[PDB]
XYZ file of N, CA and C in Angstrom:
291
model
N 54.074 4.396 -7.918
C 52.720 4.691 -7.481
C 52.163 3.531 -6.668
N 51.302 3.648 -5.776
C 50.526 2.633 -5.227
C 49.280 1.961 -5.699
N 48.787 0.767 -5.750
C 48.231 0.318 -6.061
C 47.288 -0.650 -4.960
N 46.556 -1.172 -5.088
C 45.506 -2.581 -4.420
C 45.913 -3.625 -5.419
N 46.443 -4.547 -4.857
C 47.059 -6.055 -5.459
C 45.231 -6.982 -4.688
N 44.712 -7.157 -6.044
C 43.449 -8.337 -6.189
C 43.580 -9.258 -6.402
N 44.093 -9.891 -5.931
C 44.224 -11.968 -5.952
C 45.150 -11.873 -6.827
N 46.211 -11.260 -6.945
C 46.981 -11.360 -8.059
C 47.307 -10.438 -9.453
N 45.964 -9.640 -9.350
C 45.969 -8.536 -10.658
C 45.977 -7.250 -9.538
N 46.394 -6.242 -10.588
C 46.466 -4.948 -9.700
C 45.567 -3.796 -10.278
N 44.568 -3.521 -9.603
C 44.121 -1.992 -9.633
C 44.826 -0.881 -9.402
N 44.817 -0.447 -10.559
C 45.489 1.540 -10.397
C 44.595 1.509 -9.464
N 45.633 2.547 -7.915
C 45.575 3.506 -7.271
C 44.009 4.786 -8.069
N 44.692 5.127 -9.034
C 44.073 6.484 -9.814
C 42.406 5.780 -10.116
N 42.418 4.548 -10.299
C 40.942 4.132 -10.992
C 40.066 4.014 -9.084
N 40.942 3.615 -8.106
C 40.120 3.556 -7.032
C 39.637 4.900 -6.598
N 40.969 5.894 -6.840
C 40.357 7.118 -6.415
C 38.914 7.448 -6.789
N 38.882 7.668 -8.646
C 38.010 7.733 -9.461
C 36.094 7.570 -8.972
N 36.679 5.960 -8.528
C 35.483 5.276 -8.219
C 35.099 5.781 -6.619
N 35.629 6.164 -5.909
C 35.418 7.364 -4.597
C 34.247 8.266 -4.849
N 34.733 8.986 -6.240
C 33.811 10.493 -5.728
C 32.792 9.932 -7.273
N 32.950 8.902 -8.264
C 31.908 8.606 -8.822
C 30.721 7.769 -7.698
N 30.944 6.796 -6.930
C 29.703 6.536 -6.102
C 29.673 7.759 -5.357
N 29.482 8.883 -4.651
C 29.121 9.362 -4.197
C 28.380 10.732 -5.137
N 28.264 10.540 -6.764
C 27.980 11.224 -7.542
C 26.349 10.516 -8.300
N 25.831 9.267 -7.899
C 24.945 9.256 -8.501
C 24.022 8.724 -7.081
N 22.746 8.919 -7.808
C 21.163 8.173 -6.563
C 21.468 6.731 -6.780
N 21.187 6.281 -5.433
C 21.381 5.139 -5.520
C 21.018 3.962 -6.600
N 21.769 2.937 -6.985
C 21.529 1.911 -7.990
C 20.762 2.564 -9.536
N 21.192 4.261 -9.530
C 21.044 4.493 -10.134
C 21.820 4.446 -12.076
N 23.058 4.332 -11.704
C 24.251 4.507 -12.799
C 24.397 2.985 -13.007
N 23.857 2.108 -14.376
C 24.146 0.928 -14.031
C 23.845 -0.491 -13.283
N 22.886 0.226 -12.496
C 22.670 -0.583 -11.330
C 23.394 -0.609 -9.939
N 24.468 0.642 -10.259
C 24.885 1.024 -8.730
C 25.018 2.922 -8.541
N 25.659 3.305 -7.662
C 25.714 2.322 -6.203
C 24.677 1.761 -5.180
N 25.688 0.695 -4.250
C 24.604 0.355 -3.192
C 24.765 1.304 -2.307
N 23.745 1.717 -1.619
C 23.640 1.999 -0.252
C 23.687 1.850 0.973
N 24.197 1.920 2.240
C 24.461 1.265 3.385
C 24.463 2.627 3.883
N 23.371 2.842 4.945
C 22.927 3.913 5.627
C 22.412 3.285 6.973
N 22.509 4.701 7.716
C 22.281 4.269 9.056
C 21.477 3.457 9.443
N 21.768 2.830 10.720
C 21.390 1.462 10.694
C 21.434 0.459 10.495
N 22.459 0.500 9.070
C 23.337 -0.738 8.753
C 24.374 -1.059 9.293
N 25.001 -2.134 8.667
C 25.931 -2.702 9.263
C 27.321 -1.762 9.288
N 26.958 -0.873 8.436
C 28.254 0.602 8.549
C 27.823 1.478 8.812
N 26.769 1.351 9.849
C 26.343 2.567 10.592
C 27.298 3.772 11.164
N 28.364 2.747 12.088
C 29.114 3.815 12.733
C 30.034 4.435 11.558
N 30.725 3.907 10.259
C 31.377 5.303 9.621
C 30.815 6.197 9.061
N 29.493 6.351 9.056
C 28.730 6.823 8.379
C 28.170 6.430 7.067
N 27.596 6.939 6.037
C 26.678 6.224 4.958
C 27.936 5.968 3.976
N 28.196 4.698 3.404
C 29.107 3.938 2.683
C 28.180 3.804 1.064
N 29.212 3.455 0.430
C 28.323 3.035 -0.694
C 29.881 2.227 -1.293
N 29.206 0.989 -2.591
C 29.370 0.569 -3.113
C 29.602 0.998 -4.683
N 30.893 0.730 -5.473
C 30.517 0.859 -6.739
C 31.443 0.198 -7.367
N 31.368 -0.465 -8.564
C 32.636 -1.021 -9.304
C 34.043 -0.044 -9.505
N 34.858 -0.834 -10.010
C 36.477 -0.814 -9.939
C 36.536 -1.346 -11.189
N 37.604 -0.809 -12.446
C 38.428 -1.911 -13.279
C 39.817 -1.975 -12.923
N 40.165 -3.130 -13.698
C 41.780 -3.197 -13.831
C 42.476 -2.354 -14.931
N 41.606 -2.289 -15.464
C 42.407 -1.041 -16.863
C 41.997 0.031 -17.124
N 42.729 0.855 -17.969
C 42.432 2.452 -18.112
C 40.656 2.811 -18.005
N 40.057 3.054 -17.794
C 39.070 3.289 -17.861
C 37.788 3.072 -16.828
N 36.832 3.964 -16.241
C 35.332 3.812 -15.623
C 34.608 2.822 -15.943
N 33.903 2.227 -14.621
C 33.391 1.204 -14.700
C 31.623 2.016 -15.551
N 31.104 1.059 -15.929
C 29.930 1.324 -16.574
C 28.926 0.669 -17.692
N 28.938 -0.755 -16.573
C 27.910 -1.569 -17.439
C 28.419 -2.849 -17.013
N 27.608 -3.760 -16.822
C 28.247 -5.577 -17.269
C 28.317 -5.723 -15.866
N 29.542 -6.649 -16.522
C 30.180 -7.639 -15.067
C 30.656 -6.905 -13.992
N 30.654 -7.137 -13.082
C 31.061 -6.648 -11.884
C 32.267 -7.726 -11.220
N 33.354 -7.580 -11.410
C 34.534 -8.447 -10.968
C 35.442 -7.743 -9.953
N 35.344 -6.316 -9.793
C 36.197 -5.354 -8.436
C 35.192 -4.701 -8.106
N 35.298 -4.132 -7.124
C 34.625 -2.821 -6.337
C 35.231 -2.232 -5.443
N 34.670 -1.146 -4.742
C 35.527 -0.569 -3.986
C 33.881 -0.189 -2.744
N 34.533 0.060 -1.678
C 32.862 0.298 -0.474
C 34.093 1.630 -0.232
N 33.352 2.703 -0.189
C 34.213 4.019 0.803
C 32.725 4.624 1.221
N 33.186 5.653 2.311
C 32.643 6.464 2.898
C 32.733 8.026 2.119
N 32.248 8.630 2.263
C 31.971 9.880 1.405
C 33.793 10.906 1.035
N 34.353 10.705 2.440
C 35.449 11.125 2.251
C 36.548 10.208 2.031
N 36.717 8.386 1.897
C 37.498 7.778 1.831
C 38.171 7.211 3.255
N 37.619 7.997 4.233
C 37.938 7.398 5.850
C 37.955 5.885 5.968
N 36.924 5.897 5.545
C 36.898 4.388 4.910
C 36.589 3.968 3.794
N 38.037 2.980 3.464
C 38.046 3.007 1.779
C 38.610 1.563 1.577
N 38.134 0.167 1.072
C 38.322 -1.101 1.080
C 38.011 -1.346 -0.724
N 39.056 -2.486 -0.810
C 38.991 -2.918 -2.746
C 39.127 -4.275 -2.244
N 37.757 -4.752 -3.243
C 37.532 -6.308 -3.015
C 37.138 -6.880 -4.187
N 37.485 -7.677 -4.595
C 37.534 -8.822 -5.918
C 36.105 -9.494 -5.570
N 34.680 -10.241 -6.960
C 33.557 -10.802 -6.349
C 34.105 -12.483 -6.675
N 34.801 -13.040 -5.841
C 35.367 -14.030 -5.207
C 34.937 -14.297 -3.896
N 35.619 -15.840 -3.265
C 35.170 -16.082 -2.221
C 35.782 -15.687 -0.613
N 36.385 -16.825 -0.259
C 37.826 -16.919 0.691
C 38.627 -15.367 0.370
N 38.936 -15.233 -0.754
C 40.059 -14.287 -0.868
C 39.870 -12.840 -1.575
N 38.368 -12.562 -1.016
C 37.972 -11.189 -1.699
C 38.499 -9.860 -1.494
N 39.343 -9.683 -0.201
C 39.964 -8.794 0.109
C 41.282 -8.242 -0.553
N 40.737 -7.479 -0.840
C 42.611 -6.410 -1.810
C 43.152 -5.848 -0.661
N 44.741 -5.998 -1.439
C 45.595 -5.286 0.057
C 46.248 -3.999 -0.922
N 46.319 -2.767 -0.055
C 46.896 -1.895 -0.340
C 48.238 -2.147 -0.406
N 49.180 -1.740 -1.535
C 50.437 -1.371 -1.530
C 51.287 -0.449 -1.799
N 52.082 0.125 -1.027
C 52.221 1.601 -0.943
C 53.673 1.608 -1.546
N 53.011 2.917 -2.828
C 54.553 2.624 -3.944
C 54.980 0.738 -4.448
């Protein structure tokens, strides 16, 4: 299966999906304190309205606390990025299989 390798730890594939169609399931900063919003006019204007929501590393939905992964997608995943809240090296890389 594929996964996002985070500075070293790996997010299930299946938990990023997850976190896809859960931010696009609640009002904003509503669930938790997320998701964020980024709507037209923002700085992700052109893919259209993005949102923000946490990611874990283990079996289970994010929902409450710390915030240490996330994921930003677009409603359909067109655009879909996993980032660690680190500095220099916040970017997750997809790895396929």
């Amino acid at each position: 299966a594929a996964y996002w390798d985070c500075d070293g730890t790996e997010i299930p594939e299946r938990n990023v999906r997850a976190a896809v169609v859960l931010a696009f399931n609640y009002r904003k900063e509503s669930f938790h304190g997320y998701p964020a919003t980024f709507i037209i006019g923002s700085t992700f204007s052109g893919v259209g309205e993005v949102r923000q929501f946490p990611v874990e590393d283990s079996d289970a939905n994010w929902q409450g606390g710390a915030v240490k992964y996330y994921i930003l997608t677009n409603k359909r995943g067109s655009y879909l990025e996993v980032f660690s809240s680190v500095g220099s090296g916040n970017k997750c890389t997809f790895v396929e299989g």
